[PDB]
C-alpha cells in the first residue's frame, strides 16, 4: 500500500511540475523538491521507528492522501486564481517543510524530533509519546489537559492556525511551529487568542508579496503594520510596516514573545495602526 502511495504522489507532482510551465513560496520550486524527497523516502522504506498509530507509516498514509488532494486542487486551477495559487503554494511550502523535518534524507526521525520550546517539547512527549502525528480531535483533547479551548468557532480557529498542511492532523512539527509563534507556554492559548483571534494586525496564510501589496493601501499612514507567520523561517513572525517615508518593509523580529515585540514597537512609534486601523489593542 505504502510504496504504491509514494509512486502515485511522485507522479502527481511530476504532472503538476509539467503543467506549471516567483518569490518564496513558489510551486515551481516546491514541486520538484517535494518529489525528490518522496523518492528518498521510498528508497528508505524498502530497507522506521516505533510502531503503531502516529508512527512513520501512519504519518505517510495521511500525508500522501492530503498531498494528493492538494495536488488535485492545483491541477484544477491551471486575481482569484492568483490568491488560490498563493494559498496552495504556502500549503505546499508547509508540506515540504514538514516532510523535510520528519524524514530528512528520506529517513524517519519523528520519534526523536525535539521541539524548539522546552515546555512544549515536554508536553508532546509526555502526552503523545513517540508519535509524530495525531488526528485533530485527539490532539484537541490532549492539549486540553493543559490548555483547553472552547468548542466551536474558537476551537476551529485554533485548528486552522495549527494545521499548516490543512491535513486535519497535527504533526509534532506543526506543534513546534505553533508553540514558537505563540510562546510563552504557560499562557499559550491566551497569547493565541489575543494575537490571532482578537488583534486587527494578524493575517493568516499570506505570502511576503501579498503583505507588500496589502499594506500599499496604508502607505500614506506611517505606523501601519500587519504580522503573519514567515513562510521561509517557520515558527517565526514576519512584521510588515509602513515606515516614516511611506515605504513598506518587513522584518523578522528577535526570538521572543510576539506580545513583547509588539509592545516595544508601539512604544518606539513603529507599530501603531494595526492593518492601518485607528485602534491598537492593549496587550497587557
Amino acid at each position: 500500500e505504502e510504496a504504491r502511495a509514494l509512486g502515485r504522489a511522485v507522479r502527481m507532482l511530476q504532472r503538476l511540475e509539467e503543467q506549471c510551465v516567483v518569490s518564496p513560496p513558489s510551486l515551481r520550486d516546491l514541486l520538484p523538491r517535494t518529489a525528490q524527497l518522496l523518492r528518498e523516502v521510498a528508497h528508505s522504506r524498502r530497507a522506521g521507528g516505533p510502531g503503531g498509530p502516529g508512527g512513520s507509516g501512519d504519518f505517510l498514509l495521511i500525508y500522501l492522501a492530503n498531498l494528493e488532494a492538494k495536488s488535485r486542487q492545483v491541477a484544477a486551477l491551471l486575481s482569484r486564481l492568483r490568491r488560490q495559487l498563493a494559498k496552495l503554494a504556502i500549503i505546499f511550502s508547509h508540506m515540504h517543510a514538514e516532510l523535510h523535518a520528519l524524514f530528512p534524507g528520506g529517513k524517519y526521525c519523528g520519534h526523536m524530533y525535539q521541539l524548539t520550546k522546552a515546555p512544549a517539547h515536554t508536553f508532546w512527549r509526555e502526552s503523545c509519546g513517540a508519535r509524530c502525528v495525531l488526528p485533530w480531535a485527539e490532539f484537541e483533547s490532549l492539549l486540553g489537559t493543559c490548555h483547553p479551548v472552547e468548542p466551536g468557532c474558537t476551537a476551529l480557529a485554533l485548528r486552522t492556525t495549527i494545521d499548516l498542511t490543512c491535513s486535519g492532523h497535527v504533526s509534532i512539527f506543526e506543534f513546534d511551529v505553533f508553540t514558537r509563534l505563540f510562546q510563552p507556554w504557560p499562557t499559550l492559548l491566551k497569547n493565541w487568542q489575543l494575537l490571532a483571534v482578537n488583534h486587527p494586525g494578524y493575517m493568516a496564510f499570506l505570502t511576503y508579496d501579498e503583505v507588500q501589496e496589502r499594506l500599499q493601501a496604508c502607505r500614506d499612514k506611517p505606523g501601519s503594520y500587519i504580522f503573519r507567520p514567515s513562510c521561509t523561517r517557520l515558527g517565526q513572525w514576519a512584521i510588515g510596516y509602513v515606515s516614516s517615508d511611506g515605504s513598506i518593509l518587513q522584518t523578522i523580529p528577535a526570538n521572543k514573545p510576539l506580545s513583547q515585540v509588539l509592545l516595544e514597537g508601539q512604544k518606539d512609534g513603529f507599530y501603531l495602526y494595526p492593518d492601518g486601523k485607528t485602534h491598537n489593542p492593549d496587550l497587557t
Binding site: A238, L249, Q250, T251, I252
Partner: peptide
C-alpha cells in the same frame, strides 16, 4: 524575500 533589521 527581503527582510530588514
Amino acid at each position: 524575500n527581503e527582510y530588514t533589521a
